[PDB]
Symmetry: C2
Subunit: 80 residues, 2 copies
């Protein structure tokens, strides 16, 4: 079964949730969320109505844009 | 037949953000060349810069791709 890496983020103000998981390719947004445990840690999250976006990277520049998409361009390296 | 999109370029001294209307069906690359951002910032390199796409709303049924970050928001304000 092909494996991909995904992240889930949720900003519990003054202690952020930010976790990466290895998952079976084919998993949906709802399945990743419900299988992570995030809903047990934060029982105030309501998937029927909570607002959810996805940050995708890397992408192919040939991908088709949709309403409300933001393209973020940034630098891989710091310094001065 | 149009859609509203944004393009941002984050660098150390400034955050650039611009909103555009473009033809439904446009690719990321066409949007970038169309925006004139590459003339404005000659240092942007399409093979070297990080480039990602933020999408919202999604669907709970969307199939995840490699490197997708699901962001769950707390209701405002």
């Amino acid at each position: 079964l092909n494996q991909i890496n995904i992240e889930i983020a949720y900003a519990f103000p003054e202690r952020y949730y930010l976790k990466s998981f290895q998952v079976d390719e084919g998993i949906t947004v709802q399945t990743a969320i419900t299988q992570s445990g995030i809903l047990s840690q934060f029982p105030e999250i309501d998937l029927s109505t909570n607002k959810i976006g996805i940050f995708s990277r890397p992408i192919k520049l040939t991908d088709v844009l949709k309403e409300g998409d933001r393209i973020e361009i940034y630098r891989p390296l710091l310094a001065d």
